[PDB]
Design a protein around this nucleic acid. Structure first.
Lengths: 137, 199, 251
RNA sequence: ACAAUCUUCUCACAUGAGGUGUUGAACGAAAAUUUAAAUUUAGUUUGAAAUCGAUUGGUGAAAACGGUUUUACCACUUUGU
């Protein structure tokens, strides 16, 4: 009935979204699963949130997987009450992350086909850029 | 039921394979291509769940889509590149005359009408490969060993072998994850010993 | 002169030293001779790096940037008794404080806390040339992001005199870690260096950069600045031909 | 099945080129840059620590019927020889 949201922390490296759903769906159906990831690189933040169709199922999973010695880490499973569970907390759940290679895009942005007008829009007033430093002197 | 450690263990193995594949393919486009032999014997030793799709496809191209499958392949650059890609799962070496004869005489099955049919009589071989001057098992053996003109046709006709490890000893029957001690990679002449245990 | 047919050095660095000295403004007990380092900035017209090459560039310099009192941890391929004996034989104990085999480094320091403890125990981490590739693992971002990158000391043959030569060369050389970017910062020294010494360091670094970092050297160079951890990036020199170089390259 | 392939050196002629591999979070200075967000980046703190804060450009590989959903490092050599 009530959708129970479960926080899992201290996830061993490799216990990611596919592994969590495949494992936690055993206890019962899993509605939305999102494991936090860094903006720049998309690497795991080692904690996640899961939605279970019934709060009682989330209670059972919390009582069985909390302090689980897994790959040298104790797995922290605790149910978040709905009053601090936020509606946006599942934003981007079940959707694979896109590792944008900002270094690669910036590389192409550095070395891409360019025309005379864009070169003029690049040089601008570099003399003023030098002049600003000269005023700082 | 499955426990969380297996899911993590699978992931670490998958990323282990991903790192190996990138290293082997990128900046390591070199293969040693075992020489002084035009024939190779390859057997599928291991397999992993959620196998990388590139490995999954290369295995079926080599016709090693199931564990304990054994295939005769021609020693060339193309096979060696694919064999390097799927190295951790396959054991390969140089089969001698005794192994090739024994494998064909004892564990050779032909794809007749598209089913696995035992090569018990030369009548089927003559009917299936008569147009290539292949009439007997010995014709199959000669073609395979010498890599003749119709080596491509003979290999396609031949069904992959099933060299499942044999557990005769009481210790072999009891120990866990027994696979005869089958290592992975290139063994050279040792595959004849592995063949001798199976045939 | 290699820069743009001119060398606007000397005066620029003397001014930087005068600025650094002049902007001076409990008591503490664990004091060191640490001074603000000298940072040479260099902007190129293209990304000099395809990917972060976690192996530093042994830019040989005549005024060492590493203080001679710095303790060194030597990372060698196992066995470890062999190179411990060689260090003692060559009298590097005051310099090569600890020698660690590779497997022992992989086993005894597995925690990040253990990795951090080992990292802070030493000032420089020398590593055998044939075990550098292993070190991106076993050390992780605790070393390779927190300003402790192992140095590739070449001790393959392993005799007393080569060890001494490699170590003194290791201290005598500055290091830069190539990363994908157009602008990069290289250490030239510290304020304790005189104006002439830093200028000697600058020209030697630029000679190394033009050959082994920028494929087209000075033509690839866009602008150069001198700086410390806090000061203005004082422009040492700017390209006089970049107006046409950018047009030719970006077409 | 909490086991697995993160390299214990290469090639060329003492010399040159190569090795593609980094936990997350927090604090923080001032610099070059590129086309407001993005790349390098001093210096620090930390039990493999965690309670919303996800950024969103490009490449195609299979099912499916030219759309559609599925990849949980597919990155510009860009997802199945």
């Amino acid at each position: 009935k009530k959708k129970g949201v479960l926080y899992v922390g201290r996830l061993p490296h490799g216990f990611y979204e596919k592994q969590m759903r495949m494992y936690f769906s055993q206890f019962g159906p899993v509605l939305r699963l999102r494991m936090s990831r860094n903006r720049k690189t998309g690497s795991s933040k080692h904690y996640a949130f899961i939605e279970f169709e019934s709060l009682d199922v989330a209670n059972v999973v919390a009582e069985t997987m909390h302090n689980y010695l897994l790959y040298g880490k104790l797995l922290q499973c605790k149910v978040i009450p709905e009053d601090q569970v936020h509606e946006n907390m599942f934003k981007g759940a079940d959707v694979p992350f896109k590792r944008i290679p900002h270094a690669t895009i910036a590389r192409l942005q550095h070395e891409k086909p360019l025309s005379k007008e864009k070169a003029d829009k690049l040089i601008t007033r570099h003399n003023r850029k030098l002049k600003l430093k000269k005023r700082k002197l | 039921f499955k426990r969380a450690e297996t899911f993590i263990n699978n992931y670490r193995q998958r990323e282990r394979e991903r790192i190996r594949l990138n290293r082997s393919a990128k900046n390591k486009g070199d293969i040693f291509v075992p020489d002084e032999t035009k024939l190779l014997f390859v057997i599928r030793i291991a397999g992993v769940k959620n196998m990388p799709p590139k490995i999954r496809k290369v295995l079926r191209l080599l016709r090693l889509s199931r564990i304990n499958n054994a295939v005769f392949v021609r020693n060339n650059k193309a096979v060696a590149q694919m064999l390097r890609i799927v190295e951790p799962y396959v054991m390969y070496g140089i089969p001698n005359l005794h192994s090739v004869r024994e494998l064909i005489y004892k564990r050779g099955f032909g794809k007749i009408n598209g089913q696995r049919i035992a090569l018990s009589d030369n009548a089927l071989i003559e009917e299936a490969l008569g147009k290539y001057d292949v009439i007997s098992i010995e014709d199959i053996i000669h073609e395979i060993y010498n890599v003749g003109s119709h080596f491509k046709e003979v290999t396609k006709f031949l069904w992959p072998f099933t060299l499942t490890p044999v557990k005769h000893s009481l210790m072999e029957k009891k120990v866990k994850h027994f696979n005869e001690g089958r290592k992975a990679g290139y063994c050279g002449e040792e595959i004849n010993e592995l063949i001798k245990k199976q045939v | 002169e290699l820069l743009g047919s001119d060398a606007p050095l000397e005066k620029v660095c003397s001014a930087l030293l005068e600025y650094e000295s002049k902007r001076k403004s409990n008591l503490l007990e664990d004091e060191q001779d640490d001074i603000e380092p000298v940072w040479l900035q260099l902007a190129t017209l293209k990304f000099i790096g395809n990917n972060r090459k976690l192996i530093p560039y042994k830019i040989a310099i005549k005024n060492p940037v590493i203080p001679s009192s710095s303790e060194a941890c030597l990372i060698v391929k196992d066995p470890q008794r062999v190179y411990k004996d060689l260090v003692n034989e060559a009298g590097l104990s005051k310099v090569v404080t600890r020698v660690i085999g590779l497997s022992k480094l992989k086993a005894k320091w597995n925690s990040y806390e253990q990795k951090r403890q080992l990292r802070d125990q030493f000032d420089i981490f020398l590593a055998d040339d044939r075990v550098i590739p292993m070190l991106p693992r076993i050390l992780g971002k605790t070393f390779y992001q927190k300003s402790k990158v192992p140095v590739p000391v070449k001790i393959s043959k392993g005799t007393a005199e080569q060890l001494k030569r490699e170590v003194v060369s290791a201290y005598g050389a500055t290091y830069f870690n190539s990363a994908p970017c157009s602008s990069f910062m290289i250490k030239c020294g510290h304020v304790s260096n005189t104006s002439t010494e830093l200028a000697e360091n600058v020209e030697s670094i630029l000679q190394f950069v033009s050959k082994h970092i920028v494929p087209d050297g000075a033509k690839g160079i866009a602008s150069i600045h001198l700086k410390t951890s806090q000061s203005i990036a004082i422009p040492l020199w700017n390209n006089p031909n970049l107006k046409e170089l950018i047009a030719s390259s970006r077409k």
